[PDB]
Amino acid sequence: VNPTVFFDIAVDGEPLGRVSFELFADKVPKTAENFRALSTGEKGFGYKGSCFHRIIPGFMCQGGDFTRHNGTGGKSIYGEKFEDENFILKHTGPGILSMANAGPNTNGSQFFICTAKTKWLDGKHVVFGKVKEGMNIVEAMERFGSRNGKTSKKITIADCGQLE
Amino acid sequence: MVNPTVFFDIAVDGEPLGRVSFELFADKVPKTAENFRALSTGEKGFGYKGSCFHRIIPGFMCQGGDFTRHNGTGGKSIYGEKFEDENFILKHTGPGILSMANAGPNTNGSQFFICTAKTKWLDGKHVVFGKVKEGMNIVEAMERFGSRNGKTSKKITIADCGQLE
Numbered sequence: 001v002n003p004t005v006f007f008d009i010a011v012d013g014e015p016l017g018r019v020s021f022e023l024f025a026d027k028v029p030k031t032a033e034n035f036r037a038l039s040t041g042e043k044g045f046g047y048k049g050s051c052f053h054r055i056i057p058g059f060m061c062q063g064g065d066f067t068r069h070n071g072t073g074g075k076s077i078y079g080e081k082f083e084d085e086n087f088i089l090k091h092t093g094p095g096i097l098s099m100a101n102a103g104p105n106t107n108g109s110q111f112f113i114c115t116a117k118t119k120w121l122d123g124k125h126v127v128f129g130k131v132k133e134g135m136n137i138v139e140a141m142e143r144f145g146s147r148n149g150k151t152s153k154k155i156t157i158a159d160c161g162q163l164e
Numbered sequence: 165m166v167n168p169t170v171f172f173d174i175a176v177d178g179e180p181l182g183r184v185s186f187e188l189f190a191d192k193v194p195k196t197a198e199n200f201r202a203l204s205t206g207e208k209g210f211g212y213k214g215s216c217f218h219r220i221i222p223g224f225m226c227q228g229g230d231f232t233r234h235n236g237t238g239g240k241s242i243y244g245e246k247f248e249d250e251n252f253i254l255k256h257t258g259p260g261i262l263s264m265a266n267a268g269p270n271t272n273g274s275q276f277f278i279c280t281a282k283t284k285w286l287d288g289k290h291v292v293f294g295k296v297k298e299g300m301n302i303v304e305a306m307e308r309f310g311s312r313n314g315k316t317s318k319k320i321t322i323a324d325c326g327q328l329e
Contacts, residue, residue, distance in 0.1 A: 053269070054269065062268070070267075070268055070269075070270070071266070071268030072246065084313060087313070100267070102237065102265065102267065103219040103227070103230075103237070103314055104235075104236075104314050105315075106235055110267070120224070124221065124312055124314065147252070147287075147288030149268050150269040150270075
């Protein structure tokens, strides 16, 4: 069974609700595992308490920089970076979960949640999951963003883990 | 004052391809222009000379400027690791626009991209600061080496760079 993970989202510290994700371990096991383990915190580091530092309405919500909280950091469970596993899956619509990067084979911890189909990213960012529940939470988050990604309230992962 | 101009001499696996020159819009984005200019002269003791275009996405852009890690994970400005977005006055109007790479608000460093098309979706998200003056043919030649994740089939380097008179 593909694992399920959740983020409990807060807005200026006040709980908004839960976003749940299916991770496509059946297609991208290494990429899924990274995200899974970062969500449980089981390596001693990960997404709990981190923020969505770049929210761009009509595009996506980006987060996962748990070391510098601004897009300059993050690390994977394998090292600073790891290779693009495959590009089997496409950015088909809202809810798609995909890895942020700045070049080939530079996956770390940063990720984004699409709020639209983002076809031009196909073959460039590794898709590895999708929102299962709480897309309404992601749509709510998206309203706090701007063209450059600056948010108007602090959007945090107050808690996260694996559902089972 | 006429805006400053800089040049890159581009090589392919070390073999000279040609030169790309750029106007830097110091009249609109002086801080961002100055960064790119200084990184191109090497006057601070670091900069673009010897670096590579590590992400060439044909039909979109040629991205480079990571002279510390050579892969997108590094770079630094002349102001420190990062500097704030100066302004978003200028738009991604067509081929040859120079714009700053970023991973979030206020994260400009040294990485940049040369657009090979009008990229209107980037407006307000990346700071535009210059444009190719001569050598767009060279930029199109560079795109022959790219692919969809930006991986290049040969190493595309800034063999030399500097400021023109």
